[PDB]
RNA sequence: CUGCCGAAGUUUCCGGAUAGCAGAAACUCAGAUCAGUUUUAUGAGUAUGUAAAAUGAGAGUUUCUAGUGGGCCAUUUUUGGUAAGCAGAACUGGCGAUGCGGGAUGAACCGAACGUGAGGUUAAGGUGCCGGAAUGUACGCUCAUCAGACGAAAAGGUGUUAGUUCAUGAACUAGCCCUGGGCGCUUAAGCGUACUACCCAUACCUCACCGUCUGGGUUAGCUUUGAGAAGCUCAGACGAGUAGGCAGGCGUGGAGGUUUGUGACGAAGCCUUGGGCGUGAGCCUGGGUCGAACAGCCUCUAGU
RNA sequence: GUACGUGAAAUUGCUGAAAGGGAAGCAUUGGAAAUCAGUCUUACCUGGGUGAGAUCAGUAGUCUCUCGAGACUAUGCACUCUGAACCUGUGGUAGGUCAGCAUCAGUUUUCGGGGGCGGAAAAAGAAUAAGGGAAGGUGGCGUGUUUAUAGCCUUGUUGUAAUACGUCCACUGGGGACUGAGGACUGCGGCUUCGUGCCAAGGAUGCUGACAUAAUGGUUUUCAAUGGCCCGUCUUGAAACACGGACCAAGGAGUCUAGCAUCUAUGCGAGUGUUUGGGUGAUGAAAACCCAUCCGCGAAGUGGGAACGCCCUUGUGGCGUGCACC
């Protein structure tokens, strides 16, 4: 049993065997939109541009 | 296991959601954001035997 | 931690170098403690369980 | 499992060459400050454990076969058996009338012989 | 001949009894302890110590039983110093039993500690040529007619580069230049800094193989037959080595048994740029020479 | 061929080949030259024809073993069998070194395409726009100006952004190199309505090409590149140094024995030990075999291995060897 190691970040059948999750996974889901409110108060700039 | 899995990961993602958000409000409002030290460390031997 | 366990993951069992292949590997030595897989183990290194 | 050495050249005795009066079996060098003891850069190597053979493929000819010593016709008959692990080796004090029955036994059993033609003529 | 284990190189009294280091045997023992380790806080004086937390490893033994009873390189702390060096304690490790990459070369400097190999990647050092690798990128100093690359030293510099201070100047500060491995190099192939590329160790990774150690499997011996159970099989880790210890083997003379063994159709020996086997001691064999005896296996023996 | 069996090494002469310039021999890797080794397609399968014979006879006898098992002897060649001989096939498959490619698995190196998520939700910038100054532009008179017939900076600000960097994708497309251990089946998985199903899932297979008078490698001599000190002893910190060594062959050093102790094996066991001696041994008789009387030595509370019965199991209860505690 197991004569040879088999890198499940490269064999994807030896991934599908220890991750039964990785077949529905879905990495690059989508989040942000054209509404993005950029938060960086007048308080914290003016500290960040200080001196 | 697929559902410990995917339990896992929406609980990495629900963390680091978090702290960016926690973040962004201190950022914005003004005050600041001390996230929590590190727990785990990878540490490797960089020095030989001799 | 997800690569490393991956890649060069092994285990002590009966004070061997066996490599986590299967998750029958990790379930027979730390199955006392409801890790049952890679993912367990992971989550129980990134997060530093009990 | 094809034949595998490790190592072709014998391991000759350090200054064997040198010195006729040495010969060139090889003797474990037992002075300290030799060089060739201490295994400096340059010099001769030492007959070690990992220089040994694949256990499978060891005693074996380049052809595969194992050369089994062969005296006379009840020797050939032993490897009727094992024709295809072992090949026939006629021993160097039979004569050459035991030779001849020893190759045409070995012929009929489908044996290799590995000095086959020694001490022997033909005539078609 | 090969394999495995492996020191001490010195406390204490005083040629030894020791101890200690390294093995064998007889044990018991994880619901238990141990540690060239860090802790928690308070006890005492940041250090030091404490009982009970973290990390790692299963540990404690009792008996006897080989070898050693020095030094060197020195570092550091450190005492006295004394023209000044230097010497004196402890401490620290290394060399001593240790090969390898670098250091132009190198017994003690920088890396790294070793079974046989393939591939990859590095360390310390390096990439003008010798020499494997950018005559790479960016920003600066210097031109040395004794450059630089590795005390005559105080100063002198109508030698400078940048800056600081006071303020037209004055000095000051710091750094380069002068006076006091080879070839060659000069907006470098020198020096300083930053940044990517590249070179390669016996080191690191992956794989194969050798061996040792450890753990596991294997009998109503199942048509998987793989029960020389002293066999077969699975797995993981490891590999320097002096003294010393322990296994397994190779070879020689003779003896008992055996091969219903080899031999004048050529024994033994010898020669040979013939062939093969074994990590090795060694063994088998072709040809030549030669002319009467000789060998394998099990055991015994020794003027081996 | 009496300088006489075999005829080694050191050493010497001649001949042949090769290399020559000073540490050298030697080690590693290949070239060249010389030489050598083994590996071959041949068989297998199938069909018919012809004859054959026995382990075949809707067959008769003998022998040896334990009805039938072997060996034969006659007689037949169909019924079966003999891949049996040959003709017929010109049927079909065809084994060892090299080489090439393709599908893969392991390791690794090297370019590229996208997609999320972070930062000042990048900063800039294009761009809406108010003001100001000059490295004063353009006008005005080198001096001063404030957009003129350039524009610059600052500021809020125009629809939002984009990009870079960091990070992630169980997103994806190529190139190169090394490896192929194992050897029926099991297992974990993925496809698949299910499948003696298929698969990249407990380690390489498939498709081809070249050769026997050759291909491929080995050996020897030499060359090239790289490295490389002379051994043994003694010394001391390792050394160094000083000792031994012209060469070759043969000989040449922990042996035998008497005690003692340890460990192991073997026999017997409160015993044990035949061999001072006697008996005996017909064939070799210094052996082996047998033993009368003496004698030597020896002797005269807990923990806990293992097992039983209960307890879902742990655990409890009864019973404890050896040894250490009491």
């Known amino acids: 049993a197991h004569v040879q190691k088999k890198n499940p970040l490269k064999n994807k059948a030896v991934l599908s065997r220890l991750n039964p999750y990785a077949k529905a996974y879905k990495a690059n889901v989508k989040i942000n939109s054209e509404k993005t409110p950029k938060a960086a108060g007048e308080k914290f700039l003016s500290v960040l541009h200080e001196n | 296991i697929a559902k410990r899995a995917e339990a896992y990961e929406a609980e990495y993602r629900a963390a680091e959601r978090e ?8 950022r914005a ?20 035997i001799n | 931690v997800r690569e490393l366990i991956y890649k060069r993951g092994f285990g002590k069992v009966n004070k061997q170098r066996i490599p986590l292949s299967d998750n029958a590997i990790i379930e027979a030595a730390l199955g006392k403690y ?12 990134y997060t530093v369980g009990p | 499992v094809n034949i595998i050495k490790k190592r072709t050249k014998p391991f000759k005795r350090h200054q064997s060459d040198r010195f006729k009066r040495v010969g060139e ?3 474990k060098p037992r002075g300290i400050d030799s060089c060739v003891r201490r295994r400096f850069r340059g010099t001769i190597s030492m007959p070690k454990i990992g220089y ?3 256990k499978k493929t060891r005693y074996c000819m380049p052809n595969g076969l194992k050369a089994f010593l062969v005296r006379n016709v009840s020797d050939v008959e032993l490897l009727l058996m094992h024709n295809k692990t072992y090949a026939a080796e006629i021993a160097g004090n039979v004569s050459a009338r035991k030779r001849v029955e020893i190759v045409e036994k070995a012929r009929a059993l489908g044996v290799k012989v ?4 020694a001490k022997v003529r033909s005539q078609e």
């Open chain 2, 19 to 26: 702290q960016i958000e926690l973040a962004r409000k201190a």
């Open chain 4, 25 to 27: 079996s090889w003797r």
């Open chain 4, 114 to 117: 590995t000095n086959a033609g």
């Open chain 3, 34 to 45: 409801s890790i049952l897989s890679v993912e367990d183990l992971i989550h129980e290194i």
């Open chain 2, 29 to 48: 409002e003004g005050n600041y954001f001390v996230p929590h030290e590190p727990k785990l460390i990878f540490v490797v031997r960089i020095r030989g």
């Open chain 4, 52 to 54: 040994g053979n694949n």
